[PDB]
Amino acid sequence: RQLHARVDKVDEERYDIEAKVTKNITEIADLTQKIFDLRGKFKRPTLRRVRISADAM
């Protein structure tokens, strides 16, 4: 029964570390999302194939 209480509380605790790393991952997602914004400001203008049909004809 000590084990039953242990598994109750430790199930709780592993679910809790679950939610904690879940918040870590959610904030990785959101902060890295605003960081996608930050670095996109810098890198999007070149995601393009340019100066191909300029001369070939």
Partner: peptide, 14 residues
Amino acid sequence: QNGKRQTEREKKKK
């Protein structure tokens, strides 16, 4: 003359 805490609690507890 006549919420969110509930949901996360459900998660952990179940």
